[PDB]
Amino acid sequence: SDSQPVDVDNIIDRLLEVRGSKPGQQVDLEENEIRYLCSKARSIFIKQPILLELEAPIKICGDIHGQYYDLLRLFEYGGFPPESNYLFLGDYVDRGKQSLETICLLLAYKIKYPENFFILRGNHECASINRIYGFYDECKRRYNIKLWKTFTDCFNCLPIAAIIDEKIFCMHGGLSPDLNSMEQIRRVMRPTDIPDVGLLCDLLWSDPDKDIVGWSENDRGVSFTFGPDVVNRFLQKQDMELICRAHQVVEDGYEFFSKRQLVTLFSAPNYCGEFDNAGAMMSVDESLLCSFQILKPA
């Protein structure tokens, strides 16, 4: 009577209520509502495979980094669920100052539309990184450290890659020298933190590099860079048409690599208030043709 079961439809309403407002306006979610979001989505993440098999049509977004009103802006261009299906590619928290609203809306939509809304792990969906780039501060300030740990236990169960109609391979970062076969991705055990070495690390951290042949060291201090030859060989070996990744700011919101064999998507316009970039959202139709909706910075 005083207690109630958490209602996901009700939480989505309060999250979308600030649509007509200024960036900065928060959303009071109750601490048990957020634990419900984390625990219910965690259960869905664990049931669903760690390598998602998805079907077009689908809209795809890159990094968000707590720019919550840009998340709302993306849904205004793409169609609020369930009007469009979605795949997000990671990096939901840190750097911006409304990571809480950002991840909460995504978890809510994962729970409400579990067969039509999908989110992948990025390298900022790890307790170690997000305790230096902002999400830890934000949870502590607005709630408490124990809630932040509820998020990271959930983050540790996030799927790590996706395949769209056997032809588009999707991940936050890039390829790995240890990616022997897709089965190796399916066997990655959850929950786990992101290691400093190995297949899972590279999937969430590696970068393409136009000026390299093969694999070289990554200036991020972790994982590697790969050249156009690496993408070419992987698509031949795996019989696929496109790698769709995020993880890097790109001026026009999207940017191809190795003769359009790989695309980088970035969905946070005017990233950090510094970069003057657009955001892009990639639309994949049943013919597996890709088009881009562009969100220029306000």
Residue ranges binding Mn ion (CB under 5 A): 63, 91, 122-123, 247
SS3 225: strand
209 is in an annotated binding site: no
Tokens for 212, please give them: 């390299």
Tell me whether residue 264 or residue 283 sits nearer to Mn ion (CB atom): 264
State in angstroms the smallest separation of the CB of 44 from Mn ion: 23
172 is in an annotated binding site: yes
CB burial of 12-32 (b: ≥16 within 10 Å; e: otherwise) equals: bebbeebeeeeeeeebebeee
147 to each of 111, 112, 129, 135, 143, how far by Cα in Å? Answer: 19, 22, 16, 11, 7
State in angstroms the smallest separation of the CB of 6 from Mn ion: 30
137 is in an annotated binding site: no
State in angstroms the smallest separation of the CB of 95 from Mn ion: 8
| Catalytic residue status for 124 | yes
CA torsion through residues 204, 265, 159, 155, sign: positive
247 is in an annotated binding site: yes
The one-character DSSP state at 172 is S
Angle at 262 between CA 283 and CA 287, to 5 degrees: 40
Tell me whether residue 91 or residue 209 sits nearer to Mn ion (CB atom): 91
Tell me whether residue 63 or residue 202 sits nearer to Mn ion (CB atom): 63
Catalytic site residue from 42, 121, 124, 245: 124
Sequence ranges of the binding site for Mn(2+):
63, 65, 91, 123, 172, 247
Q: Give the residue numbers marked as catalytic.
A: 124
